[PDB]
Design a protein around this ligand. Structure first.
Ligand SMILES: Cc1cc2nc3c(=O)[nH]c(=O)nc-3n(C[C@H](O)[C@H](O)[C@H](O)COP(=O)(O)OP(=O)(O)OC[C@H]3O[C@@H](n4cnc5c(N)ncnc54)[C@H](O)[C@@H]3O)c2cc1C
Ligand SMILES: Cc1cc2nc3c(=O)[nH]c(=O)nc-3n(C[C@H](O)[C@H](O)[C@H](O)COP(=O)(O)OP(=O)(O)OC[C@H]3O[C@@H](n4cnc5c(N)ncnc54)[C@H](O)[C@@H]3O)c2cc1C
Ligand SMILES: O=C(O)/C=C/c1c[nH]cn1
Ligand SMILES: O=C(O)/C=C/c1c[nH]cn1
Ligand SMILES: [Cl-]
Ligand SMILES: [Cl-]
Ligand SMILES: [Cl-]
Ligand SMILES: [Cl-]
Ligand code: NA
Ligand code: NA
Lengths: 454, 454
């Protein structure tokens, strides 16, 4: 079997969907090939919070922002190693990208909630309904079906097809044990995500991130797009810069979105029954703090009063069930029971929470200077979750220009080849800020589909 | 020539002076040997700001603090690698150390000023009169003369004397081209400071910090105390952790205390005439930001209105004269002249300052979110200073216990040998917080003199 389309997109995450919808809208034929049996990749299981300076939600909330500040925040976050034009183009197109999600894809965002990720000077992360990428990918899928964008699941790209001029003119893919050739008349878009779930690639570029660490990502995040492009002499950069997320499942590696309760008053408790870091510190600080605790894990503890504001249990019931079945999470009536289930010294936990309750009442955390104010934890019920850092995002990847054209080892455009999303390596410097992956994948996914369609 | 004292102290910085005064006060004979022609080492040229949780000045200013928070701040600052008992003993003795400086040494601190160094959750750095160590070392010197503590300048310790039991029983030193033997009946205190000015030792332990970087320290900061103790099998740790200070002379390496005006409204301007980092960001962030600018330097720009509050020109007139003579600093009437003297694009500088003036008026810095509020810079005169990062403090050094006893490679006490101050390597982890060196050198200097005298 062979197929022919104008634009062949590899991957059904936010970057690939954005490229596909733009290619179809330009009047071209397009397909997305997806190696998993389900669509959406890490974009699906993402929190999908998306930074935008100058959003309609900021206006609703009375929050002032500027592109200049979003750019400076972002460049600083990556230790000033990100490509300034890549960051500028991301920020310059972020409002349009989010309004396009709202108006064209019909993604629903909360009109009056924003998150301020570490490193951002103001609250600027839009929040999709449900606080996950489920809303985003489901709406993308509906819109793709409406406009006539086919998605071929269980179809694994294995090789880029390069003609004698050096132009990329298609993709060889595996489906049901056979090779299928996808001819691409105008362009191939690599939108395959990162390599957080490729242990050998992690160890090659960052030996510390070995089998001691899980991955927050899906099993398909294995760097295939980098490997396939390097075979035809695409350049890569920043491959060793790989970030972790602090509060993840010790068993599966999955992120614990349910533990976003720490932004609403949950406390981090070590095996000794003691707090050990400000719960609102930067994520890398929290990760290092946890790895310095006994056993290299923490507990996250909160009560019904916090859930009634935060809703992270209601919003992440699959995590609740999975973590509970894995023995990583308990719902308990009393702090004494919270200590018992995890062999935490009872007297120390009770003393810690007595202090927390006093700090909540005064607004002054005399142990760690909690920046927003603690919440009284004297009454339950309680959730207590065991968590540890897990590998989360690969900042490195393919070298592209701001038009998403992939460049070779001499900086020359590889004709017919584009790349967008976590597979690229020039936006985030040494360290991506929270909420900036979604901005990157939508902005550059759209550009890639536009450029491939030309 | 030979001398005999109960306690022989090597170095006349804050650690050595503290040890000497305690030894004399215990009723023992003591001497300080100092290799330079002047006393005070880096403690002399320090800002000498000293962190204390629970000081009389905090009480005057209505500021609440706690030892728990000072400990947690400190441990976090060094990436959780500092020795917890060393940090606890430092914090537990900080109030007593500062009250001892005030009441016994007669150091004058401002009663109503404190500095909040990066990483500290509350304002807690006491400020000596004059905003330098000159006050501290001059008062130490007077007190030493009053109590009968001799200081032998131009006397360089070269070898520790070890008897057949393994006990350290003296020091061989060079003076006027001859070797002088100092017999120590009860103890030798190594208080020799750090190795920021030893290029070969820097390169050995941190190859990046080579000849591209100057040193903020005096010429005597060469690691001699580490070398002399390792010869008799003292252990060392954390030697590769070496911190820089962001705003220093590109010619001499000296710190620019005069540029503490950035805590009162001065702006950082690159060669392009643009701001590029929040001026109140963490020092390591500022250092990296500067090294990312054209030429790897910044300018620091402020006006008379800022000086009338900050006083950093009045307090650091020697810097003013030296930097000006070196072509690194100008006093100018207009922003146009500030641009001219350093070949900064005039239009860009004027546009940058127009923005600053608007941000000062509104309190909202739309470019970098200055956390305290900018100050109008429309009227002069102005100072503009060229600055770059310089090597500043060596966190590593000798292994001691909390009694300042030096330990060998098997963790065993070396009898008769003590060490205190920047020469030790267990307090600050990977990164010392501002103001914490002075706390360390006084607390542990006092302990070392007390323990050596026993
Ligand atoms: C749990 C989690 C939470 C996150 N939360 C946030 C957040 O709130 N905000 C934020 O900004 N970022 C967040 N991130 C990061 C962000 O979600 C991702 O970086 C981003 O979604 C990646 O999008 P993408 O389109 O590049 O790739 P993906 O979404 O990973 O999609 C790539 C797709 O390509 C497919 N593919 C790969 N190789 C092949 C091949 N050979 N053939 C065919 N198909 C292939 C994969 O199967 C996958 O479906 C989160 C990440 C995770 C894991
Ligand atoms: C410019 C500057 C500003 C600073 N500002 C601050 C600040 O505000 N707050 C803060 O907390 N920290 C600050 N620091 C750091 C702090 O001042 C130092 O870490 C601290 O003063 C070191 O004290 P010390 O007693 O260990 O050593 P030093 O003060 O360096 O004294 C050691 C002495 O031993 C002598 N010596 C060395 N080898 C020999 C030998 N072989 N024989 C004899 N004598 C020898 C040296 O000549 C020197 O005089 C600053 C540092 C500098 C350089
Ligand atoms: O890594 C990110 O950008 C966001 C992670 C996250 C956590 N909770 C919601 N999103
Ligand atoms: O490095 C420190 O602890 C302090 C440096 C400084 C700058 N200005 C006054 N002190
Ligand atoms: Cl703007
Ligand atoms: Cl690289
Ligand atoms: Cl206290
Ligand atoms: Cl070490
Ligand atoms: Na990447
Ligand atoms: Na040290």
């Amino acid at each position: 079997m062979e197929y022919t389309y104008d634009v062949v997109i590899i991957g059904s995450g936010g970057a690939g969907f954005s490229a596909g919808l733009e290619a179809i809208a330009a009047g071209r034929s397009a397909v997305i090939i997806e190696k998993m049996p389900i669509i959406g990749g890490n974009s699906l299981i993402s929190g999908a919070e998306m930074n935008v300076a100058g959003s309609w939600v900021q206006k609703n909330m009375g929050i002032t922002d500027s592109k200049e500040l979003f750019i400076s925040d972002t460049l600083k976050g990556g230790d000033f190693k990100g490509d300034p034009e890549m960051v500028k183009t991301m920020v310059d197109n972020a409002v349009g990208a989010a309004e396009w999600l709202r108006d064209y894809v019909k993604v629903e965002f909360y009109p009056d909630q924003l998150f301020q990720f570490g490193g951002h000077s103001v609250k600027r992360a839009l929040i999709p309904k449900g606080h996950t990428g489920a809303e985003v990918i489901s709406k993308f899928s509906i819109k793709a079906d409406e406009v006539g964008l086919p998605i071929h699941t269980n179809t694994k790209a294995e090789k880029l097809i390069q003609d004698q001029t050096g132009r990329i003119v298609g993709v060889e893919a595996a489906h049901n044990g056979k090779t299928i050739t996808y001819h691409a008349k105008r362009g191939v878009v690599i939108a395959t995500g990162g390599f957080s779930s490729n242990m050998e690639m992690r160890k090659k570029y960052n030996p510390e991130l070995d089998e001691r660490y899980g991955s927050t990502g899906h099993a398909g995040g294995t760097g295939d797009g980098i490997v396939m492009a390097e075979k035809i002499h695409a350049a890569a950069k920043n491959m060793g810069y790989i970030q972790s997320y602090p509060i993840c499942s010790p068993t599966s590696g999955a992120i614990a979105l349910i533990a976003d309760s720490r932004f609403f008053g949950a406390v981090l408790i070590n095996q000794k029954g003691e707090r050990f870091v400000e719960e609102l510190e930067r994520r890398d600080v929290i990760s290092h703090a946890i790895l310095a605790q006994p056993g290299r894990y923490t507990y996250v503890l909160w009560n019904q009063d916090i859930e009634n504001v935060a809703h992270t249990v209601e919003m992440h019931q699959g995590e609740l069930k999975e973590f509970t079945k894995d023995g990583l999470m308990y719902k308990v009536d009393t702090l004494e029971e919270a200590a018992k289930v995890f062999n935490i010294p009872e007297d120390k936990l009770l003393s810690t929470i007595k202090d927390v309750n006093h700090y909540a009442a005064t607004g002054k955390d005399e142990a760690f200077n909690h920046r927003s104010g603690l919440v009284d934890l004297s009454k339950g019920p309680y959730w207590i979750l065991k968590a540890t850092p897990s590998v989360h995002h690969t900042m490195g990847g393919l070298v592209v220009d701001t038009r998403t054209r992939v460049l070779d080892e001499q900086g020359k455009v590889i004709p017919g080849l584009f790349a967008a999303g976590e597979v690229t390596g020039l936006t985030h410097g040494t360290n991506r800020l929270g909420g900036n992956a979604y901005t990157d994948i939508i902005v550059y996914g759209r550009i890639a589909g536009q450029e491939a369609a030309k």
